[PDB]
Amino acid sequence: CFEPPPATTTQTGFRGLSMGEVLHPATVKAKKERDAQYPPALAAVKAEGPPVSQVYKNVKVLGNLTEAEFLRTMTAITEWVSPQEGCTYCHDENNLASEAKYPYVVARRMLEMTRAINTNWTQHVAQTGVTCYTCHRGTPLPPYVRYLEPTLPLNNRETPTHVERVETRSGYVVRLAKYTAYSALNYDPFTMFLANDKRQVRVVPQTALPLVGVSRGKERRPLSDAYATFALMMSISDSLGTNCTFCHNAQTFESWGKKSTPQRAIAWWGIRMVRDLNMNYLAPLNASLPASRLGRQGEAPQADCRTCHQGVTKPLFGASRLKDYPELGPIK
Amino acid sequence: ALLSFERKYRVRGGTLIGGDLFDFWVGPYFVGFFGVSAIFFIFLGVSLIGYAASQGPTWDPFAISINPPDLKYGLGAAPLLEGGFWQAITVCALGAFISWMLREVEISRKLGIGWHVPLAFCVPIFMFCVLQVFRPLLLGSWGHAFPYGILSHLDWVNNFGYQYLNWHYNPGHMSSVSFLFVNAMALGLHGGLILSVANPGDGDKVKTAEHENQYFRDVVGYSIGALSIHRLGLFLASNIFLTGAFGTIASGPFWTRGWPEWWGWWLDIPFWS
Amino acid sequence: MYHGALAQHLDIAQLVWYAQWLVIWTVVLLYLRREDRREGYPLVEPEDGQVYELPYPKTFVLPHGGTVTVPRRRPETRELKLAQTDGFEGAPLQPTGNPLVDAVGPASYAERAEVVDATVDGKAKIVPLRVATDFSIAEGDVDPRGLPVVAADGVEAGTVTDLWVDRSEHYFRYLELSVAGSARTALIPLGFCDVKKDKIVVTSILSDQFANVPRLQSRDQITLREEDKVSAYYAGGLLYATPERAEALL
Amino acid sequence: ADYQTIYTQIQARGPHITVSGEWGDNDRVGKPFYSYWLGKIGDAQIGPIYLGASGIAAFAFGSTAILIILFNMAAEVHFDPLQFFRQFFWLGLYPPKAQYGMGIPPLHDGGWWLMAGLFMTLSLGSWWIRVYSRARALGLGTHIAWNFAAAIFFVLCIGCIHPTLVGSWSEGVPFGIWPHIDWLTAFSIRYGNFYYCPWLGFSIGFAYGCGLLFAAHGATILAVARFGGDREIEQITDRGTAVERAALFWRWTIGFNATIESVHRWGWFFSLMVMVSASVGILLTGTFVDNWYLWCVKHGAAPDYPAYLPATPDPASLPGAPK
């Protein structure tokens, strides 16, 4: 029923505004332990000899690397993505240049995506950056993905009950609730805001009085937009294991300046990053994936905030491998 | 300066502390020891409010705000301008509320009536201690308490709620609001019933205790009765804070997640999952 | 342009803010606070202020004949056995005799009408069970008839002989008892009774103080003023049963 | 201690009382029964109840509304009774999600909501008639009926008047336990934080005021139960020591007092004002005010605070920023 004290509390706002994080130490500890499973960097290898663009037959992304550097990368990739399946998950054991197996072309795309994240979205990921591990956590299927309809469990490594299965119609409201921190908000904020750039998250007027011409009948956004933005915010909160005051002073959700924390700006970049990833890297992979990977509408699994953050305000508490694997970005 | 029926009741005695020392009236006001301590705490607290405010950005009554310390001061004293004024004002508020209550006891005793009023008044006092003393103690800092400012206290309430994602799903708050709502409705019904009996209108006759009971018997099939509605009214009003306090105290010390998730106890039972 | 915007950078909600405080103040000050003065006014110490604070009289038409108008002049005739403890105007008074018998302080009764309170059909409302024979005690509750009445000094004050029921509300309001050694009967409000299986404990007065409980004019009915006299006598005990009781409790 | 103020020590029983109305004496059904445990803290007698046309119509209209809601809720769980019991608090009947303006929305997107609202409204009006007409029948003033009219009015404000005033049914309150709750936040978000709406302030202040007053009045009457304070009607027509003492308690405490009648005017007024204030707030919202916080800033009322963590420019308005 309850969580026994003490609670860890921080301050994110001027004193007396009741702004800050509220954490349960046992939960924090468990998440630290899960995330400390991040494999250590492999020993550095000296650059030596020709680039693998000369040496190997089919290298399109990592061509600048030397043989030893390249094979190190492949080892890391295996540790991060398919440590249980091994090299042959992506590779034909007799022809390492072969693309016959689907994971191979997908992983090349993933290599581009990862370098794009670390090169073009530093406004989000800063110098911490991402690796394949950040999302994959040692399994080909990342534990936290979204389809074009809510799915349970959130972690696809846990076995679904019959009701949780997306085909069980009686379980819909629960699938929706658990994506929105248990609220009854009747909106899927993933398909609405994160799949693409079609919708606007902001819903609050920017003036005291209603502007004539946007405030009557069909000129107005329907109130459903405000429930939906609330849904997304519930979902983002749960995805980072935080609360609204991590980003906002609830006095005025719509205001920036002193009324928002620097974390809110970073979150705003994160929405842009997620939509880029989804529209430009992840959704197009439905042409390359077996049918069995696809959602009921033929969609590839996509990314949300949870995909990386998995209940923590920085993914893996800020662990980095950026300087260890410069081949993953930033690319000059 | 005296009600026409008042003099016979203006007798000596009934105090808790002080006896004859402060046993007198100033105009309509009984004094007593606790009148004197009330005045003292009030003067002190209002003076500290005025002084603190004078050192701030504004004189606008709605925007003035006197705030507790940063969380990092924990339970220690803070510089006056960094929470210390707030600390001193809290102590004065408590002193004033408690004196006011104890003075109500003396007034009751003097009149030979029950002490039910000061007892009822312990409830909002207790609620204030929950917000400002007990919850902050449980969390380890005075800084979790609310600021003194007409609108700023609402920013605190607001942020406090959203720290738990949706405060509306807090079982303590659901309980508390339900009692607020039913209490407000019951006060309307009680006031209206009594007025409707004593004021039928148009030169008609004042009605009776029997008409009173008939009315609700007819409308809802039951009538609680004249004394009982007063006991009920007190029970409902009181339980606004008596149950609300559990929701407040639980938030942080006994629950750190969003409140909607708490209802997982019901939703996640393996049987119907 | 903006909905609600008026000339001079005023807006509609802003006007409704002033209007709402105006309704609130008008109702509170001009209506309620005047209704609050239908009793006890004018004060005692013809000023304009005394007229302005009062509402227009209203007349209640009583269910069993006659009328009552409020506010009305009601000066308190009855001589009060009380003296100033000091010259200062807010100084309390002190009893000059027996405050219980003299009916001062918490032992005061109001000058209510010397009229028997009535049921809706015009019968006496508050009557003993010997008269209200269709009324009974709920099963599961103590029948106090026959029980001793034990006063604050732990001495037996008398014996319960009857209960007085309110016929209009189906609710007992008094116990009637025989007063030990005084050859008389006396009523006590149930609010001053701690009802036990084997006795009725009364902390409000001492055993010998039962001798002077106000007497009724009739055996089987009670006036509004008598109800006040009877209740007030026990309430007086709370402050006056012993000299100690008026003094600081701590 | 006055044990009578906690519970009735000795309960009385007697023949049940019937007060004759101007009409409807033959529509009382039931043979009253008595509860011994209820008789500790109230009257023991339960029933009989008055029927009448108005009350029956109210049940008829009310049940329809409820059936429409339950049926749509059960659709939401695809008619599985187990999931229905489990998910109940989460299930709701919603107004249109899409913007149709004032156009009658399709059944699947708001239409059923609107039917439910209609039948609820008729239920409320019919019950209002019962409330009003029982008082006339028994020769009583109309005080309760005005208080109830204000409560009904507020319901129409949030249900359809405000939606009509902005021209969108999408703004209505959903039917459902959690869903009606979620509406509260959605509304507050849309209109820039209702803590900055003065009518929220007035309505809450009067609600807390009802709390203070019922506590104070309830305790005051208990404190004078020994003098028959509870017999308030004859204390009004014939002042007793009970209310002399009540008045003086307050006069000596706060410097002024009521009468036994006028305290009920105070209570009735405060209660009325919860609903009046709330309604006015809702009528102003969207119609004449779009963001309440900004409105308070405009009028110089809103408090401001120093930054704690650095101030944070809106990234959207930065040079080079994407959309």
Ligand code: BCB
């Ligand atoms: C986004 C955040 C929200 C929030 C956050 C919130 C919090 C965080 C808390 C409440 C709490 C409560 N909320 Mg909630 N709330 C409520 C209603 C309520 C109250 C019933 C209740 C207790 C208030 C209290 O503690 O007063 C306290 C008042 C005190 C202590 C005053 C004491 C009086 C003092 C002794 C005497 C003072 C005298 C003066 C200084 C003297 C003046 C001198 C002059 C007059 C002469 C409603 C009706 C709604 C609606 C309709 O939406 C709502 C929505 C919301 N609340 C939002 C969802 N609310 C509290 C609760 O119980 O939660 C479970 C609580 O902690």
Ligand code: BCB
């Ligand atoms: C846990 C949630 C809480 C909460 C939530 C809350 C909400 C959500 C709202 C208020 C509002 C109000 N609150 Mg706050 N509050 C207030 C005082 C007040 C008033 C400014 C106002 C009207 C309340 C009312 O009429 O009550 C009933 C009492 C009546 C009718 C008797 C008269 C009360 C009198 C108006 C109080 C005057 C207070 C003074 C301005 C401040 C003290 C004066 C000193 C310096 C001399 C006090 C004194 C306290 C104390 C001592 O704890 C308190 C605690 C709390 N409030 C908690 C922090 N309160 C409303 C508002 O308008 O805010 C701007 C509003 O919407």
Ligand SMILES: C/C=C1/c2cc3[nH]c4c(c3C)C(=O)[C@H](C(=O)OC)c4c3nc(cc4[nH]c(cc(n2)[C@@H]1C)c(C(C)=O)c4C)[C@@H](C)[C@@H]3CCC(=O)OC/C=C(/C)CCC[C@H](C)CCC[C@H](C)CCCC(C)C
């Ligand atoms: C500030 C002032 C306030 C205020 C005022 C006032 N509020 C009043 C009154 C006044 C003055 C009355 O006079 C009137 C009344 O009468 O009081 C006894 C009433 C009311 N306040 C109700 C509910 C309420 N007030 C709330 C709030 C506030 N109120 C605010 C705060 C809240 C909140 C806040 O949640 C709630 C839930 C109802 C009890 C009643 C509605 C009538 C009705 O009910 O219409 C609808 C009538 C029906 C008959 C529909 C129900 C039928 C179902 C199917 C029952 C089926 C069960 C059946 C046993 C099974 C057999 C089936 C068979 C048929 C086959």
Ligand SMILES: C/C=C1/c2cc3[nH]c4c(c3C)C(=O)[C@H](C(=O)OC)c4c3nc(cc4[nH]c(cc(n2)[C@@H]1C)c(C(C)=O)c4C)[C@@H](C)[C@@H]3CCC(=O)OC/C=C(\C)CCC[C@H](C)CCC[C@H](C)CCCC(C)C
């Ligand atoms: C559940 C039961 C409840 C309940 C019950 C009862 N309620 C009572 C009584 C009973 C029984 C009385 O007997 C007593 C009284 O006499 O009635 C006339 C009283 C009273 N209820 C007051 C306010 C009230 N009740 C509230 C709530 C409930 N009431 C709930 C609902 C609320 C809110 C907001 O909810 C408010 C604001 C005063 C009017 C009065 C105290 C006078 C005092 O204590 O004088 C002594 C103190 C002063 C005159 C001022 C002291 C100033 C300090 C030193 C400096 C200010 C510090 C302050 C903390 C700053 C706050 C800033 C602000 C913007 C955040």
Ligand SMILES: C/C=C1/c2cc3[nH]c4c(c3C)C(=O)[C@H](C(=O)OC)c4c3nc(cc4[nH]c(cc(n2)[C@@H]1C)c(C(C)=O)c4C)[C@@H](C)[C@@H]3CCC(=O)OC/C=C(\C)CCC[C@H](C)CCC[C@H](C)CCCC(C)C
């Ligand atoms: C995050 C979002 C929030 C939010 C939202 C909003 N807060 C609102 C509103 C909105 C939108 C309003 O619109 C309304 C209002 O004033 O607008 C101006 C209101 C109010 N906030 C009060 C208190 C408060 N707010 C707080 C805060 C927050 N507020 C934050 C900001 C806080 C604290 C402490 O934080 C407090 C204490 C109330 C006094 C006041 C009246 C409510 C009421 O009293 O409702 C109850 C009234 C009823 C239920 C009427 C029912 C009567 C009918 C007759 C009974 C019919 C039943 C019948 C049985 C039918 C049968 C069933 C049917 C299916 C057949």
Ligand SMILES: CC(C)=CCC/C(C)=C\CC/C(C)=C\CC/C(C)=C/CC/C(C)=C/CC/C(C)=C/CC/C(C)=C/CC/C(C)=C/CC/C(C)=C/CC1=C(C)C(=O)c2ccccc2C1=O
């Ligand atoms: C610098 C500075 C400010 C410091 C100086 C301090 C200062 C102010 C004191 C000056 C020194 C003075 C004058 C003398 C000292 C003596 C002394 C102790 C005085 C105290 C002064 C003081 C602090 C006064 C404040 C009083 C106060 C808290 C009033 C609040 C009143 C409020 C808002 C009430 C809310 C509830 C409400 C709306 C009530 C209205 C209805 C009423 C009157 C109900 C009461 C009431 C009820 C409830 C009944 O049931 C009833 C039943 C039958 C008959 C009558 C009544 C009845 O009257």
Ligand code: HEC
């Ligand atoms: C996650 C899928 C994946 C895993 C697992 C994987 N690889 Fe690769 N491998 C690739 C991709 C993609 C490329 C092409 C990279 C490019 O185009 O720059 C590649 C290229 C290669 C090549 C170059 C072949 C050529 O001549 O073109 C070699 C050699 C290689 N990997 C070895 C390994 C080894 C050894 C392991 C086990 C440590 C491994 N791989 C595991 C995806 C994978």
Ligand code: HEC
């Ligand atoms: C932004 C989070 C994210 C990052 C970072 C990421 N991936 Fe992926 N990956 C996904 C998603 C989502 C899918 C689609 C789900 C799936 O097919 O398993 C996927 C799918 C894959 C698959 C196919 C899995 C299968 O069998 O269906 C491979 C192989 C893969 N990624 C390799 C990589 C490599 C190699 C890297 C590092 C260069 C990487 N991923 C980094 C999110 C990520």
Ligand code: HEC
């Ligand atoms: C991790 C940071 C973060 C957290 C936590 C967060 N938000 Fe936000 N919120 C944002 C950002 C960024 C935006 C702006 C999105 C955009 O413009 O694309 C926003 C937008 C909003 C808006 C719309 C503001 C407007 O201009 O119309 C509301 C309302 C809101 N959030 C409420 C909430 C609520 C309620 C919570 C907690 C349940 C919450 N937020 C938690 C970052 C956050």
Ligand SMILES: CC(C)=CCC/C(C)=C/C=C/C(C)=C/C=C/C(C)=C/C=C\C=C(C)\C=C\C=C(/C)CC/C=C(/C)CCCC(C)C
């Ligand atoms: C031109 C057009 C056609 C005419 C206009 C139609 C019209 C008047 C529409 C009006 C619509 C209105 C007034 C809508 C208002 C809806 C509101 C305020 C809903 C609010 C809350 C609803 C809730 C909480 C409903 C919950 C429902 C359930 C729990 C299932 C029903 C079962 C119950 C036992 C309900 C009792 C609720 C409670 C006492 C426990």
Ligand SMILES: COC1=C(OC)C(=O)C(CC=C(C)C)=C(C)C1=O
């Ligand atoms: C004046 O006395 C009153 C009653 O009894 C006569 C009531 O039953 C009621 C109604 C309460 C219930 C629980 C039916 C009220 C409001 C009341 O004021």
Ligand SMILES: COC1=C(OC)C(=O)C(CC=C(C)C)=C(C)C1=O
């Ligand atoms: C299906 O009906 C339901 C109940 O009734 C048995 C509940 O008690 C509960 C538990 C809630 C309370 C307030 C006991 C829920 C959630 C519910 O949905």
Ligand SMILES: CCCCCCCCCCCC[N+](C)(C)[O-]
């Ligand atoms: C507002 C809904 C209208 C539905 C009509 C409900 C029937 C009410 C019948 C009135 C009762 C007649 N009577 C006896 C009180 O005069």
Ligand SMILES: CCCCCCCCCCCC[N+](C)(C)[O-]
């Ligand atoms: C709960 C909301 C209460 C907010 C009330 C704010 C009222 C603003 C309008 C009056 C402004 C007067 N002024 C300049 C003194 O601030």
Ligand SMILES: CCCCCCCCCCCC[N+](C)(C)[O-]
């Ligand atoms: C926000 C709710 C405000 C309601 C108004 C409060 C009423 C209490 C004022 C009592 C007036 C006192 N007196 C003696 C000066 O009239």
Ligand SMILES: [Fe+2]
């Ligand atoms: Fe009353």
